[PDB]
Subunit: 50 residues, 2 copies
């Protein structure tokens, strides 16, 4: 299953007009996210005093 896209890119905005001036707006957004390894594989309780 590798070597094949699994989605579509779309960042458009569509307006649909119904009667009585109501309007359905459809906002579409796509972004490319970059993820890094976690600093630590642990949960940390951290205190912060300035």
């Amino acid at each position: 299953g590798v070597g094949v896209s699994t989605g579509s890119y779309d960042n458009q905005t569509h307006y649909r007009f119904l009667g009585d001036g109501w309007v359905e707006i459809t906002a579409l957004a796509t972004r490319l996210v970059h993820l890094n390894m976690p600093k630590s594989e642990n949960y940390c309780r951290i205190r912060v005093h300035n």
Copy 2:
């Protein structure tokens, strides 16, 4: 038949929205007109040289 109005006054503007963003606009206008006696009861051929 005298002493009774024969019309309605209306100077509004209405917008009707159909699908696909088409719009029907209905412009309504009323005015009170003043009419004076004709200067002459005749048809006149008039020349104008400046």
